[PDB]
Amino acid sequence: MLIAFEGIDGSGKTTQAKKLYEYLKQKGYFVSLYREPGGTKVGEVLREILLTEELDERTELLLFEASRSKLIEEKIIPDLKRDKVVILDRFVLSTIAYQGYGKGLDVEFIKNLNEFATRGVKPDITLLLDIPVDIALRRLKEKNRFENKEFLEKVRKGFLELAKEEENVVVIDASGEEEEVFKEILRALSGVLR
Amino acid sequence: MLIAFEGIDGSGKTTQAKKLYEYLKQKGYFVSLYREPGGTKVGEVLREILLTEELDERTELLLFEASRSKLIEEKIIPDLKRDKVVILDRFVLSTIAYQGYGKGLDVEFIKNLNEFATRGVKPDITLLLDIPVDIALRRLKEKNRFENKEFLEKVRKGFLELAKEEENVVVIDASGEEEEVFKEILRALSGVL
User: Fold this and answer.
1) Which of A61, A112, A141, A168 is deepest in the core (most CB within 10 A)?
2) Quick check: B45 contacting A, CB < 8 Å?
3) Cβ distance of B69 and A53 shorter than 8 Å
4) Residue B61 C-alpha from the chain's centroid
5) Residue-range domains of chain B with CATH
6) What count of other Cβ atoms lies within 10 Å of the Cβ of residue A164?
7) Are B185 and B12 in contact (CB under 8 A)?
8) CA dist., res. B168 & res. B163, Å (int)
9) Is A13 annotated as contributing to ligand binding?
10) List the disulfide bonds (chain B).
11) Is A49 touching B (CB cutoff 8 A)?
């Protein structure tokens, strides 16, 4: 089965994805955890490019999608075939929210590109870790990271739109404390898991 | 203006494109010559990846297009704005022929992806350097290069298919010698220069 975390920077996706990883492992599921971009050797070099270079939004989109494609074919599809629980730190909604609602590219094109990269593989559940931008920024600030408030407001709105429009998306209040947010995730998953 | 060379490996694309580059620089055009993938800093690192790694066809297409996207935005578009002649060794038809007709991805999807990567920038003329695979192989074989005849036969058919339906594609009999092929390309280019 496939569980996708989605959300803005500073929403705690990496921390909560790791928590979910360790928790399901101990309950006896076989589980993988991958981040996007990255999660494969080729994906990780592309992650370095995406993090360091000055890329236009179109080239940036195609590289995100190339990383995803590599991950889907190299790991996710085989993992899923062997009944692993696959947990993603970011997936197809983030691409639409960032490149579409944020950077202005066409949403329907992004979805078609998403479908191509994924071979139609969709999550069993998508966890949207929703958080206000100022609170997300204040947390990032604690690690000396500064992201763009104007950009992230559009991205956040994108996410909440997509959670209405798209299938199997649960909105998690990610402004809470680490444990309370995890508990809320577990409840949203109980209608698909253990 | 934008001049694109297309065709299978062994058709002499690079040789002809360099000849065209040298010729037009002599006759007083400001010209650019780029290869795909490549031609920008980022696009050359993606070329390295494409030339080394074991890649599925979907990842490969997406990386070809990312290189193209970079080259288009960084260089082709500005170059064209200042009336440079941009010559390309491989372009959008090669992606369709290779990834679509060759490896079986959807041709219509590839077209749309090309359209996105290029911002709708189309060549003024496309020179398809058509050659039989046997002859392309015979020529490649004398550089210690070996390519798949089965694969390349499909890709040739694809290229010729595209020449019939797509706009501004002149089919150049690239089976000839270097100078007679270049003479044919110049004939084809008189109707735009």
Assistant:
1) A61
2) yes
3) no
4) 14
5) 1-193 (3.40.50.300)
6) 8
7) no
8) 8
9) yes
10) none
11) yes
